[PDB]
């Protein structure tokens, strides 16, 4: 069995290997990459996403979200308070302000220490989940707006044509902006390209051990767990690496820098934080190997998770027994 310790693998595809996206995902899996839940892909030196980032300031962040924490430093939830619209230029200035800017630090490990010590005492503002793309239309390799769609994959594998669309999303971050512990909708893959700016640190639990994280989470957030049998779908709970280690939860960590891709694999729980002002693009995707995970994915039906239009067909076709309850949670 390849990668039996479930380490995060880093790949350096050549320009030739960068042509065929599906083929390379399958290659990474042949080497055991998916066992970690997360892989990093460093693009060949010949590749670029676009020519420059000099002209992005006028993008609108219609609903910036202030991420307010509750709990203790290593075990907390966050809620998202909606703020007034602002441009990316305005958001960048805010991120760089004394109130929000990254503190002085020695290295990534020092900044990680500072994150986990102090995150809860601040409320950073995240420009998350903005439909759009920063890839140039002429970028033919690993262009996240040009991937094969999940509806087409489902139709190819299973024969059923379904409604729905699959487009990318932009994320504008600042110091301490946080992504809570989650797997993707329907336990899909995700891919995330860090276009510009400061790094993103990731934590990940191997898919084969995801239920260990779920059991810890139920213990640590006992009210939330009574409320919903899949409350991590709410995407609000944080647990620090120190707490995970104290509880024997297998995990790994890695820092993504600008110009690098990360892929999350089906049922790979992940969480993390941004180091300073940055912009990432991400999308969900599927492969043949996903279908079995999609059939078994948990679902939130309590009303909280509320998701895209396109998840309806995935539930309907892959989880017909669950569909009526889930759709009620949508309504
Ligand atoms: O970058 C973020 O805030 C969160 N991203 C992801 O969870 C992802 O790409 O799957
Ligand atoms: Mg612009
Ligand atoms: Ni994710
Ligand atoms: Zn729920």
């Amino acid at each position: 069995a390849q990668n039996p310790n479930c380490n995060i693998m880093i790949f350096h595809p050549t320009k030739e290997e960068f042509n065929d996206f599906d083929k390379y995902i399958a290659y990474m899996e042949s080497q055991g990459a998916h066992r970690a839940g997360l892989a990093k892909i460093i693009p060949p030196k010949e590749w670029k996403a676009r020519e420059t980032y000099d002209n992005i300031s006028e993008i609108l962040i219609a609903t910036p979200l202030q991420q307010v924490a509750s709990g203790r430093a290593g075990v907390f939830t966050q809620y998202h308070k909606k703020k007034k619209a602002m441009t990316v230029g305005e958001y960048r200035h805010l991120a760089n302000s004394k109130k929000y800017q990254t503190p002085p630090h020695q290295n990534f490990e020092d900044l990680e220490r500072k994150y986990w010590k102090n995150r809860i005492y601040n409320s950073p503002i995240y420009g998350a989940d903005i439909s759009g793309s920063l890839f140039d239309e002429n970028t033919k390799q690993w262009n996240l707006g040009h991937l094969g769609t999940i509806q087409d994959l489902l139709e190819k594998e299973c024969g059923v044509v379904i409604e729905g669309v699959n487009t990318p999303y932009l994320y504008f971050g600042m110091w301490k902006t946080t992504f809570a512990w989650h797997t993707e909708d329907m336990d899909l893959y995700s891919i995330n390209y860090l276009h510009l700016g400061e790094p993103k640190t990731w934590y990940v639990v191997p898919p084969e051990h995801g239920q260990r994280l779920e059991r810890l989470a139920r213990e640590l957030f006992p009210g939330s767990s009574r409320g919903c049998g899949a409350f991590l779908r709410h995407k609000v709970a944080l647990i620090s690496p120190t707490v995970l280690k104290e509880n024997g939860i297998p995990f790994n960590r890695i820092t993504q820098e600008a110009g690098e891709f990360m892929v999350t694999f089906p049922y790979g729980y992940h969480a993390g934080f941004n180091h300073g002002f940055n912009c990432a693009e991400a999308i969900n995707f599927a492969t043949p190997r996903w279908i079995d995970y999609g059939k078994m994915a948990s679902q939130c039906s309590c009303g909280e998770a509320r998701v895209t239009f396109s998840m309806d067909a995935f539930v309907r076709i892959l989880q017909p027994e669950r569909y009526d309850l889930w759709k009620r949670g949508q309504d």
Side-chain angles (χ1 to χ4, degrees), residues 1-47 49-50 52-81 83-214 216-244 246-305 307-327 329-330:
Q2 296 266 235
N3 194 22
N5 285 355
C6 302
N7 296 316
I8 298 167
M9 300 179 71
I10 304 164
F11 294 91
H12 287 87
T14 63
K15 65 186 192 309
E16 295 81 15
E17 284 171 342
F18 221 49
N19 290 320
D20 185 335
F21 181 85
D22 286 344
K23 181 184 189 174
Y24 199 77
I25 301 303
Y27 169 71
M28 296 158 55
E29 293 181 355
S30 78
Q31 305 303 293
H34 56 294
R35 294 196 62 186
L38 183 67
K40 175 177 292 194
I41 309 91
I42 293 171
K45 68 191 185 292
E46 300 89 355
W47 180 91
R50 68 177 304 109
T52 83
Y53 291 88
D54 291 338
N55 307 118
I56 68 168
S57 302
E58 313 304 309
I59 291 172
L60 191 69
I61 305 171
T63 317
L65 301 177
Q66 180 168 52
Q67 302 188 293
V68 181
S70 297
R72 62 184 177 103
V75 180
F76 61 91
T77 58
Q78 57 186 12
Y79 82 94
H80 293 171
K81 182 173 177 173
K83 306 295 284 178
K84 293 191 153 146
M86 75 181 77
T87 66
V88 162
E90 291 163 341
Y91 178 85
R92 180 175 62 230
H93 191 260
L94 188 69
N96 293 336
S97 72
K98 292 191 190 178
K99 178 170 181 72
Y100 292 110
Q101 66 188 214
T102 317
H105 60 283
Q106 297 294 350
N107 49 46
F108 294 167
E109 174 168 4
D110 187 29
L111 194 67
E112 178 182 44
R113 179 190 67 69
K114 289 171 184 299
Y115 174 87
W116 290 104
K117 184 177 167 55
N118 301 316
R119 158 69 185 97
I120 64 171
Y121 301 111
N122 298 85
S123 297
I125 293 167
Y126 204 0
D129 287 319
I130 295 161
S131 293
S133 186
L134 291 173
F135 286 89
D136 181 320
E137 70 182 3
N138 295 319
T139 299
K140 303 314 184 189
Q141 300 170 312
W142 286 57
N143 183 322
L144 299 190
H146 295 169
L147 302 178
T149 67
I150 299 160
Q151 296 78 19
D152 284 342
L153 183 283
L154 182 152
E155 173 189 330
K156 289 181 295 196
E157 298 299 294
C158 300
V160 58
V161 183
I162 53 164
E163 75 289 353
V165 293
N166 176 204
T167 58
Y169 296 89
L170 300 177
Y171 299 79
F172 292 94
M174 68 168 63
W175 169 233
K176 285 170 174 173
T177 53
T178 300
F179 52 110
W181 281 106
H182 69 284
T183 63
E184 303 301 310
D185 290 343
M186 215 70 187
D187 296 346
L188 281 159
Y189 294 73
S190 67
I191 181 164
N192 180 301
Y193 181 67
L194 190 51
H195 279 284
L196 65 94
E198 303 317 305
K200 188 189 294 287
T201 291
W202 299 67
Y203 305 90
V204 59
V205 175
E208 69 204 63
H209 303 301
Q211 295 83 1
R212 295 184 185 220
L213 183 69
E214 293 174 350
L216 178 64
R218 289 190 304 269
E219 296 162 357
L220 298 177
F221 304 98
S224 294
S225 175
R226 288 185 287 272
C228 181
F231 76 94
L232 293 176
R233 292 288 169 206
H234 306 168
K235 309 194 300 184
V236 305
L238 278 303
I239 303 165
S240 72
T242 295
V243 174
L244 294 180
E246 283 166 348
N247 290 276
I249 308 305
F251 76 95
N252 282 297
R253 76 193 80 189
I254 194 168
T255 299
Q256 178 192 20
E257 298 186 77
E260 303 178 340
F261 290 90
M262 303 300 296
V263 165
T264 84
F265 294 88
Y267 198 60
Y269 275 103
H270 55 283
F273 63 89
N274 295 307
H275 293 207
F277 170 70
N278 64 18
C279 171
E281 182 171 340
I283 199 177
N284 297 118
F285 72 91
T287 71
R289 197 176 67 78
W290 167 69
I291 295 281
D292 285 350
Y293 289 88
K295 292 175 174 168
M296 295 189 300
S298 69
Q299 302 298 356
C300 165
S301 308
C302 78
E304 281 302 308
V307 304
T308 184
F309 178 113
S310 308
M311 226 186 98
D312 191 280
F314 303 158
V315 183
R316 198 171 67 246
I317 297 310
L318 298 180
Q319 308 183 307
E321 188 271 330
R322 290 179 169 178
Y323 180 68
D324 281 353
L325 185 73
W326 173 82
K327 191 161 48 59
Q330 242 45 5

